[PDB]
Amino acid sequence: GSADETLCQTKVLLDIFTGVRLYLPPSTPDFSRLRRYFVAFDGDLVQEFDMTSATHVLGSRDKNPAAQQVSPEWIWACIRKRRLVAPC
């Protein structure tokens, strides 16, 4: 858990995914916030079948190999780091 420890602050948001365009999948856990939260921070979210121009992608990249194959742990480590960390 981390989320509960991080999002424990209403949505916390910080300059994590700062400009980080990661494709947040709907199948991803905590998506609810993950989405609003992420894009909220100041980044952007592209729909799986919509990334071509995207920048980041949660779990896989296919839809957009030009994006970043980050995970749920990245968001936390990122948001918490206040600076986009190693996407993976």
MMTF fields as JSON, N, C-alpha, C and O atoms, coordinates in Angstrom:
{
  "mmtfVersion": "1.0.0",
  "mmtfProducer": "UNKNOWN",
  "numBonds": 351,
  "numAtoms": 352,
  "numGroups": 88,
  "numChains": 1,
  "numModels": 1,
  "chainsPerModel": [1],
  "groupsPerChain": [88],
  "chainIdList": ["A"],
  "bondAtomList": [4, 2, 8, 6, 12, 10, 16, 14, 20, 18, 24, 22, 28, 26, 32, 30, 36, 34, 40, 38, 44, 42, 48, 46, 52, 50, 56, 54, 60, 58, 64, 62, 68, 66, 72, 70, 76, 74, 80, 78, 84, 82, 88, 86, 92, 90, 96, 94, 100, 98, 104, 102, 108, 106, 112, 110, 116, 114, 120, 118, 124, 122, 128, 126, 132, 130, 136, 134, 140, 138, 144, 142, 148, 146, 152, 150, 156, 154, 160, 158, 164, 162, 168, 166, 172, 170, 176, 174, 180, 178, 184, 182, 188, 186, 192, 190, 196, 194, 200, 198, 204, 202, 208, 206, 212, 210, 216, 214, 220, 218, 224, 222, 228, 226, 232, 230, 236, 234, 240, 238, 244, 242, 248, 246, 252, 250, 256, 254, 260, 258, 264, 262, 268, 266, 272, 270, 276, 274, 280, 278, 284, 282, 288, 286, 292, 290, 296, 294, 300, 298, 304, 302, 308, 306, 312, 310, 316, 314, 320, 318, 324, 322, 328, 326, 332, 330, 336, 334, 340, 338, 344, 342, 348, 346],
  "bondOrderList": [1, 1, 1, 1, 1, 1, 1, 1, 1, 1, 1, 1, 1, 1, 1, 1, 1, 1, 1, 1, 1, 1, 1, 1, 1, 1, 1, 1, 1, 1, 1, 1, 1, 1, 1, 1, 1, 1, 1, 1, 1, 1, 1, 1, 1, 1, 1, 1, 1, 1, 1, 1, 1, 1, 1, 1, 1, 1, 1, 1, 1, 1, 1, 1, 1, 1, 1, 1, 1, 1, 1, 1, 1, 1, 1, 1, 1, 1, 1, 1, 1, 1, 1, 1, 1, 1, 1],
  "groupList": [{"groupName": "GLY", "atomNameList": ["N", "CA", "C", "O"], "elementList": ["N", "C", "C", "O"], "formalChargeList": [0, 0, 0, 0], "bondAtomList": [1, 0, 2, 1, 3, 2], "bondOrderList": [1, 1, 2], "singleLetterCode": "G", "chemCompType": "PEPTIDE LINKING"}, {"groupName": "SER", "atomNameList": ["N", "CA", "C", "O"], "elementList": ["N", "C", "C", "O"], "formalChargeList": [0, 0, 0, 0], "bondAtomList": [1, 0, 2, 1, 3, 2], "bondOrderList": [1, 1, 2], "singleLetterCode": "S", "chemCompType": "L-PEPTIDE LINKING"}, {"groupName": "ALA", "atomNameList": ["N", "CA", "C", "O"], "elementList": ["N", "C", "C", "O"], "formalChargeList": [0, 0, 0, 0], "bondAtomList": [1, 0, 2, 1, 3, 2], "bondOrderList": [1, 1, 2], "singleLetterCode": "A", "chemCompType": "L-PEPTIDE LINKING"}, {"groupName": "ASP", "atomNameList": ["N", "CA", "C", "O"], "elementList": ["N", "C", "C", "O"], "formalChargeList": [0, 0, 0, 0], "bondAtomList": [1, 0, 2, 1, 3, 2], "bondOrderList": [1, 1, 2], "singleLetterCode": "D", "chemCompType": "L-PEPTIDE LINKING"}, {"groupName": "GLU", "atomNameList": ["N", "CA", "C", "O"], "elementList": ["N", "C", "C", "O"], "formalChargeList": [0, 0, 0, 0], "bondAtomList": [1, 0, 2, 1, 3, 2], "bondOrderList": [1, 1, 2], "singleLetterCode": "E", "chemCompType": "L-PEPTIDE LINKING"}, {"groupName": "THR", "atomNameList": ["N", "CA", "C", "O"], "elementList": ["N", "C", "C", "O"], "formalChargeList": [0, 0, 0, 0], "bondAtomList": [1, 0, 2, 1, 3, 2], "bondOrderList": [1, 1, 2], "singleLetterCode": "T", "chemCompType": "L-PEPTIDE LINKING"}, {"groupName": "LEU", "atomNameList": ["N", "CA", "C", "O"], "elementList": ["N", "C", "C", "O"], "formalChargeList": [0, 0, 0, 0], "bondAtomList": [1, 0, 2, 1, 3, 2], "bondOrderList": [1, 1, 2], "singleLetterCode": "L", "chemCompType": "L-PEPTIDE LINKING"}, {"groupName": "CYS", "atomNameList": ["N", "CA", "C", "O"], "elementList": ["N", "C", "C", "O"], "formalChargeList": [0, 0, 0, 0], "bondAtomList": [1, 0, 2, 1, 3, 2], "bondOrderList": [1, 1, 2], "singleLetterCode": "C", "chemCompType": "L-PEPTIDE LINKING"}, {"groupName": "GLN", "atomNameList": ["N", "CA", "C", "O"], "elementList": ["N", "C", "C", "O"], "formalChargeList": [0, 0, 0, 0], "bondAtomList": [1, 0, 2, 1, 3, 2], "bondOrderList": [1, 1, 2], "singleLetterCode": "Q", "chemCompType": "L-PEPTIDE LINKING"}, {"groupName": "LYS", "atomNameList": ["N", "CA", "C", "O"], "elementList": ["N", "C", "C", "O"], "formalChargeList": [0, 0, 0, 0], "bondAtomList": [1, 0, 2, 1, 3, 2], "bondOrderList": [1, 1, 2], "singleLetterCode": "K", "chemCompType": "L-PEPTIDE LINKING"}, {"groupName": "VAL", "atomNameList": ["N", "CA", "C", "O"], "elementList": ["N", "C", "C", "O"], "formalChargeList": [0, 0, 0, 0], "bondAtomList": [1, 0, 2, 1, 3, 2], "bondOrderList": [1, 1, 2], "singleLetterCode": "V", "chemCompType": "L-PEPTIDE LINKING"}, {"groupName": "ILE", "atomNameList": ["N", "CA", "C", "O"], "elementList": ["N", "C", "C", "O"], "formalChargeList": [0, 0, 0, 0], "bondAtomList": [1, 0, 2, 1, 3, 2], "bondOrderList": [1, 1, 2], "singleLetterCode": "I", "chemCompType": "L-PEPTIDE LINKING"}, {"groupName": "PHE", "atomNameList": ["N", "CA", "C", "O"], "elementList": ["N", "C", "C", "O"], "formalChargeList": [0, 0, 0, 0], "bondAtomList": [1, 0, 2, 1, 3, 2], "bondOrderList": [1, 1, 2], "singleLetterCode": "F", "chemCompType": "L-PEPTIDE LINKING"}, {"groupName": "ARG", "atomNameList": ["N", "CA", "C", "O"], "elementList": ["N", "C", "C", "O"], "formalChargeList": [0, 0, 0, 0], "bondAtomList": [1, 0, 2, 1, 3, 2], "bondOrderList": [1, 1, 2], "singleLetterCode": "R", "chemCompType": "L-PEPTIDE LINKING"}, {"groupName": "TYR", "atomNameList": ["N", "CA", "C", "O"], "elementList": ["N", "C", "C", "O"], "formalChargeList": [0, 0, 0, 0], "bondAtomList": [1, 0, 2, 1, 3, 2], "bondOrderList": [1, 1, 2], "singleLetterCode": "Y", "chemCompType": "L-PEPTIDE LINKING"}, {"groupName": "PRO", "atomNameList": ["N", "CA", "C", "O"], "elementList": ["N", "C", "C", "O"], "formalChargeList": [0, 0, 0, 0], "bondAtomList": [1, 0, 2, 1, 3, 2], "bondOrderList": [1, 1, 2], "singleLetterCode": "P", "chemCompType": "L-PEPTIDE LINKING"}, {"groupName": "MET", "atomNameList": ["N", "CA", "C", "O"], "elementList": ["N", "C", "C", "O"], "formalChargeList": [0, 0, 0, 0], "bondAtomList": [1, 0, 2, 1, 3, 2], "bondOrderList": [1, 1, 2], "singleLetterCode": "M", "chemCompType": "L-PEPTIDE LINKING"}, {"groupName": "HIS", "atomNameList": ["N", "CA", "C", "O"], "elementList": ["N", "C", "C", "O"], "formalChargeList": [0, 0, 0, 0], "bondAtomList": [1, 0, 2, 1, 3, 2], "bondOrderList": [1, 1, 2], "singleLetterCode": "H", "chemCompType": "L-PEPTIDE LINKING"}, {"groupName": "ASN", "atomNameList": ["N", "CA", "C", "O"], "elementList": ["N", "C", "C", "O"], "formalChargeList": [0, 0, 0, 0], "bondAtomList": [1, 0, 2, 1, 3, 2], "bondOrderList": [1, 1, 2], "singleLetterCode": "N", "chemCompType": "L-PEPTIDE LINKING"}, {"groupName": "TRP", "atomNameList": ["N", "CA", "C", "O"], "elementList": ["N", "C", "C", "O"], "formalChargeList": [0, 0, 0, 0], "bondAtomList": [1, 0, 2, 1, 3, 2], "bondOrderList": [1, 1, 2], "singleLetterCode": "W", "chemCompType": "L-PEPTIDE LINKING"}],
  "groupTypeList": [0, 1, 2, 3, 4, 5, 6, 7, 8, 5, 9, 10, 6, 6, 3, 11, 12, 5, 0, 10, 13, 6, 14, 6, 15, 15, 1, 5, 15, 3, 12, 1, 13, 6, 13, 13, 14, 12, 10, 2, 12, 3, 0, 3, 6, 10, 8, 4, 12, 3, 16, 5, 1, 2, 5, 17, 10, 6, 0, 1, 13, 3, 9, 18, 15, 2, 2, 8, 8, 10, 1, 15, 4, 19, 11, 19, 2, 7, 11, 13, 9, 13, 13, 6, 10, 2, 15, 7],
  "groupIdList": [1, 2, 3, 4, 5, 6, 7, 8, 9, 10, 11, 12, 13, 14, 15, 16, 17, 18, 19, 20, 21, 22, 23, 24, 25, 26, 27, 28, 29, 30, 31, 32, 33, 34, 35, 36, 37, 38, 39, 40, 41, 42, 43, 44, 45, 46, 47, 48, 49, 50, 51, 52, 53, 54, 55, 56, 57, 58, 59, 60, 61, 62, 63, 64, 65, 66, 67, 68, 69, 70, 71, 72, 73, 74, 75, 76, 77, 78, 79, 80, 81, 82, 83, 84, 85, 86, 87, 88],
  "secStructList": [7, 7, 2, 2, 2, 2, 6, 6, 1, 6, 6, 7, 7, 7, 1, 1, 1, 6, 6, 7, 5, 7, 7, 7, 7, 6, 6, 1, 6, 6, 2, 2, 2, 2, 2, 2, 2, 2, 2, 2, 2, 6, 7, 5, 7, 7, 7, 6, 6, 7, 7, 6, 6, 7, 7, 7, 3, 3, 1, 7, 7, 6, 6, 7, 6, 6, 1, 7, 3, 3, 7, 2, 2, 2, 2, 2, 2, 2, 2, 2, 2, 6, 1, 7, 7, 7, 7, 7],
  "xCoordList": [0.194, 0.0, 0.442, 0.444, 0.734, 1.166, 0.084, -0.028, -0.686, -1.75, -2.395, -2.362, -2.974, -3.623, -2.697, -3.159, -1.425, -0.451, -0.115, 0.349, -0.34, -0.062, -1.323, -1.428, -2.268, -3.515, -4.206, -5.268, -3.616, -4.172, -4.402, -5.034, -3.91, -4.064, -5.024, -4.644, -6.209, -7.205, -6.848, -7.801, -6.021, -5.607, -4.203, -3.591, -3.65, -2.318, -1.948, -2.843, -1.519, -1.136, 0.233, -0.165, 0.949, 2.268, 2.817, 2.203, 3.968, 4.593, 5.312, 6.492, 4.613, 5.184, 5.274, 6.268, 4.253, 4.224, 4.331, 3.829, 4.979, 5.147, 5.361, 6.429, 4.353, 4.44, 4.554, 4.897, 4.304, 4.379, 3.073, 2.055, 3.079, 1.898, 1.836, 2.219, 1.361, 1.252, -0.173, -1.124, -0.324, -1.63, -2.177, -1.788, -3.079, -3.674, -4.805, -5.838, -4.613, -5.575, -6.727, -6.531, -7.93, -9.136, -9.116, -9.809, -8.324, -8.219, -7.287, -7.249, -6.534, -5.611, -6.375, -7.432, -5.843, -6.427, -6.271, -5.259, -7.271, -7.24, -7.356, -7.136, -7.702, -7.845, -8.59, -8.137, -9.732, -10.529, -9.644, -9.728, -8.81, -7.916, -6.763, -6.434, -6.149, -5.038, -5.203, -4.276, -6.382, -6.661, -6.66, -5.64, -7.797, -7.922, -6.653, -6.095, -6.189, -4.989, -3.851, -3.378, -3.411, -2.334, -2.552, -2.108, -3.237, -3.511, -3.652, -3.248, -4.226, -4.418, -3.075, -2.881, -2.151, -0.835, -0.389, 0.101, -0.558, -0.172, 0.303, 0.867, 0.077, 0.485, -0.665, -1.435, -0.786, -1.839, -2.069, -1.175, -3.265, -3.605, -4.23, -5.201, -3.677, -4.181, -4.869, -4.418, -5.942, -6.683, -5.876, -5.339, -5.789, -5.049, -5.007, -3.95, -6.154, -6.24, -5.972, -6.256, -5.425, -5.123, -3.859, -3.919, -2.712, -1.444, -0.5, 0.243, -0.523, 0.329, 1.094, 2.319, 0.374, 0.988, 1.234, 1.971, 0.619, 0.773, 2.242, 3.087, 2.55, 3.915, 4.214, 5.286, 3.27, 3.441, 2.293, 1.232, 2.503, 1.489, 1.628, 2.703, 0.554, 0.561, 0.439, -0.51, 1.393, 1.382, 1.423, 0.302, 2.196, 2.317, 2.575, 2.509, 2.87, 3.137, 2.541, 2.113, 2.511, 1.968, 1.188, 1.68, -0.034, -0.874, -0.013, -0.353, 1.103, 2.004, 3.385, 3.643, 4.275, 5.633, 6.444, 7.563, 5.881, 6.555, 6.25, 6.761, 5.416, 5.049, 5.95, 6.986, 5.623, 6.404, 5.618, 4.449, 6.257, 5.615, 5.789, 6.5, 5.143, 5.228, 4.187, 3.351, 4.235, 3.296, 2.658, 2.829, 1.92, 1.242, 2.257, 2.039, 3.37, 4.409, 5.139, 5.681, 5.154, 5.816, 5.092, 5.717, 3.779, 2.975, 3.283, 3.582, 3.211, 3.484, 4.895, 5.087, 5.884, 7.27, 7.477, 8.275, 6.76, 6.862, 6.228, 6.936, 4.939, 4.223, 4.925, 5.059, 5.376, 6.059, 7.401, 7.857, 8.049, 9.333, 9.171, 10.157, 7.936, 7.653, 8.302, 8.219, 8.949, 9.607, 9.527, 9.916, 9.046, 8.922, 10.161, 11.279, 9.966, 11.065, 11.206, 10.644, 11.959, 12.17, 10.877, 10.392, 10.315, 9.089, 9.34, 10.279, 8.5, 8.631, 8.031, 8.254],
  "yCoordList": [-0.53, 0.0, 1.209, 1.623, 1.806, 2.966, 3.982, 4.948, 3.821, 4.723, 5.267, 6.473, 4.401, 4.799, 5.669, 6.532, 5.468, 6.236, 7.501, 8.473, 7.502, 8.649, 9.42, 10.581, 8.812, 9.442, 9.786, 10.409, 9.388, 9.654, 11.128, 11.563, 11.902, 13.32, 13.765, 14.527, 13.324, 13.682, 13.272, 12.647, 13.334, 12.97, 13.303, 12.973, 13.949, 14.323, 14.73, 15.559, 14.737, 15.107, 15.711, 14.77, 16.046, 16.629, 16.68, 16.15, 17.313, 17.429, 16.14, 16.161, 15.017, 13.726, 13.537, 13.924, 12.95, 12.716, 14.035, 14.161, 15.017, 16.317, 16.165, 15.734, 16.517, 16.416, 14.968, 14.721, 14.048, 12.636, 12.169, 12.133, 11.818, 11.357, 9.854, 9.223, 9.27, 7.846, 7.402, 7.989, 6.363, 5.849, 5.018, 3.863, 5.601, 4.913, 4.023, 4.516, 2.71, 1.715, 1.689, 1.919, 1.409, 1.34, 0.086, 0.012, -0.902, -2.146, -1.973, -2.819, -0.876, -0.602, -0.324, 0.306, -0.793, -0.624, 0.819, 1.457, 1.337, 2.7, 3.661, 4.862, 3.137, 3.952, 5.231, 6.326, 5.095, 6.238, 7.451, 8.398, 7.451, 8.549, 8.542, 9.575, 7.384, 7.25, 8.212, 8.947, 8.209, 9.078, 10.52, 11.203, 10.989, 12.346, 12.761, 13.816, 11.966, 12.256, 12.585, 13.721, 11.601, 11.793, 13.079, 14.147, 12.981, 14.133, 15.371, 16.463, 15.204, 16.305, 16.928, 18.129, 16.126, 16.604, 17.682, 18.733, 17.424, 18.371, 17.627, 18.23, 16.315, 15.502, 15.338, 16.274, 14.152, 13.873, 12.376, 11.588, 11.978, 10.581, 10.324, 10.981, 9.372, 9.035, 7.683, 6.786, 7.522, 6.28, 5.22, 5.475, 4.027, 2.937, 3.106, 3.385, 2.937, 3.073, 4.514, 4.912, 5.299, 6.689, 7.088, 7.507, 6.959, 7.304, 7.848, 8.795, 7.264, 7.696, 8.942, 8.991, 9.953, 11.192, 11.16, 11.993, 10.201, 10.066, 10.169, 10.397, 10.006, 10.081, 8.919, 8.319, 8.597, 7.51, 6.523, 6.864, 5.296, 4.267, 3.332, 2.779, 3.15, 2.283, 0.837, 0.475, 0.012, -1.386, -1.6, -1.405, -1.895, -2.122, -0.819, 0.258, -0.913, 0.254, 0.067, 1.033, -1.178, -1.484, -0.293, 0.455, -0.113, 0.986, 2.184, 2.943, 2.356, 3.459, 3.139, 3.315, 2.666, 2.309, 3.569, 3.501, 4.723, 5.991, 6.537, 7.589, 5.822, 6.238, 5.565, 5.025, 5.569, 4.962, 3.831, 3.999, 2.675, 1.525, 1.558, 0.726, 2.514, 2.649, 1.764, 1.167, 1.677, 0.867, 1.696, 2.914, 1.036, 1.657, 2.075, 3.041, 1.349, 1.649, 2.919, 3.628, 3.207, 4.389, 5.635, 6.556, 5.666, 6.795, 7.139, 8.29, 6.147, 6.353, 6.882, 7.993, 6.092, 6.482, 7.852, 8.647, 8.132, 9.401, 10.487, 11.344, 10.471, 11.451, 11.708, 12.859, 10.667, 10.784, 11.429, 12.181, 11.171, 11.727, 13.141, 13.856, 13.55, 14.874, 15.058, 16.135, 14.01, 14.061, 12.705, 11.699, 12.655, 11.421, 10.568, 11.024, 9.326, 8.416, 7.468, 7.711, 6.386, 5.409, 4.66, 3.918, 4.855, 4.227, 2.755, 2.406, 1.889, 0.462, -0.145, -1.337],
  "zCoordList": [0.0, 0.0, 0.0, 1.159, -0.566, -0.629, -0.891, -0.136, -1.88, -2.227, -0.97, -0.724, -0.183, 1.04, 1.852, 2.599, 1.728, 2.449, 1.698, 2.293, 0.418, -0.399, -0.645, -0.25, -1.279, -1.571, -0.304, -0.314, 0.804, 2.077, 2.223, 3.186, 1.303, 1.336, 0.257, -0.633, 0.315, -0.657, -1.975, -2.443, -2.682, -3.953, -4.106, -5.121, -3.137, -3.168, -4.558, -4.725, -5.265, -6.6, -6.588, -5.901, -6.599, -6.588, -7.999, -8.925, -8.173, -9.469, -9.811, -10.163, -9.711, -10.011, -11.513, -12.128, -12.109, -13.535, -14.279, -15.395, -13.672, -14.282, -15.776, -16.212, -16.566, -18.005, -18.429, -19.585, -17.62, -17.913, -18.516, -17.826, -19.769, -20.452, -20.464, -21.449, -19.386, -19.278, -19.56, -19.045, -20.381, -20.727, -19.578, -19.404, -18.792, -17.666, -18.146, -18.599, -18.049, -18.453, -17.462, -16.269, -17.956, -17.166, -16.31, -15.295, -16.715, -15.984, -14.798, -13.904, -14.786, -13.709, -12.426, -12.453, -11.299, -9.989, -9.543, -9.836, -8.833, -8.354, -9.526, -9.372, -10.696, -11.883, -11.545, -11.879, -10.881, -10.501, -10.312, -11.095, -9.31, -9.027, -10.013, -10.596, -10.202, -11.115, -12.278, -12.616, -12.893, -14.013, -13.554, -13.646, -13.058, -12.588, -11.873, -12.175, -10.942, -10.193, -11.147, -11.182, -11.917, -12.864, -13.643, -13.222, -14.781, -15.611, -14.741, -15.14, -13.549, -12.63, -12.287, -12.476, -11.787, -11.422, -12.397, -11.984, -13.694, -14.719, -15.956, -16.869, -15.99, -17.115, -18.093, -18.312, -18.685, -19.635, -19.729, -19.421, -20.154, -20.286, -21.649, -22.023, -22.391, -23.707, -23.662, -22.949, -24.403, -24.442, -25.172, -26.25, -24.585, -25.185, -26.695, -27.262, -27.349, -28.787, -29.186, -30.316, -28.264, -28.523, -27.781, -26.625, -28.443, -27.84, -28.9, -28.642, -30.081, -31.169, -30.761, -30.881, -30.276, -29.853, -28.352, -27.822, -27.665, -26.232, -25.86, -26.726, -24.595, -24.124, -23.2, -23.278, -22.322, -21.389, -21.521, -22.043, -21.047, -21.113, -19.924, -19.691, -19.171, -18.011, -18.452, -19.148, -18.052, -18.409, -19.832, -20.302, -20.627, -22.002, -22.738, -22.145, -24.031, -24.84, -26.225, -26.857, -26.7, -28.006, -28.53, -29.375, -28.03, -28.45, -28.817, -29.725, -28.112, -28.368, -27.822, -26.631, -28.694, -28.356, -28.104, -27.596, -28.459, -28.273, -26.887, -26.503, -26.132, -24.796, -23.778, -24.165, -22.548, -21.492, -20.854, -20.509, -20.694, -20.099, -18.587, -18.023, -17.934, -16.495, -15.832, -16.51, -14.501, -13.756, -12.655, -12.611, -11.763, -10.65, -9.601, -8.87, -9.526, -8.567, -8.974, -8.127, -10.277, -10.785, -10.301, -9.777, -10.476, -10.058, -8.608, -8.291, -7.727, -6.32, -6.138, -5.644, -6.536, -6.414, -7.035, -6.54, -8.119, -8.806, -7.958, -7.428, -7.82, -7.036, -5.74, -5.325, -5.09, -3.845, -4.063, -3.202, -5.168, -5.485, -6.005, -6.184, -6.249, -6.749, -8.107, -8.698, -8.606, -9.889, -10.569, -9.975, -11.763, -12.509, -12.305, -12.541, -11.867, -11.633, -12.813, -13.881, -12.622, -13.669, -13.943, -13.089, -15.136, -15.571, -15.851, -16.567, -15.287, -15.475, -15.255, -15.463]
}
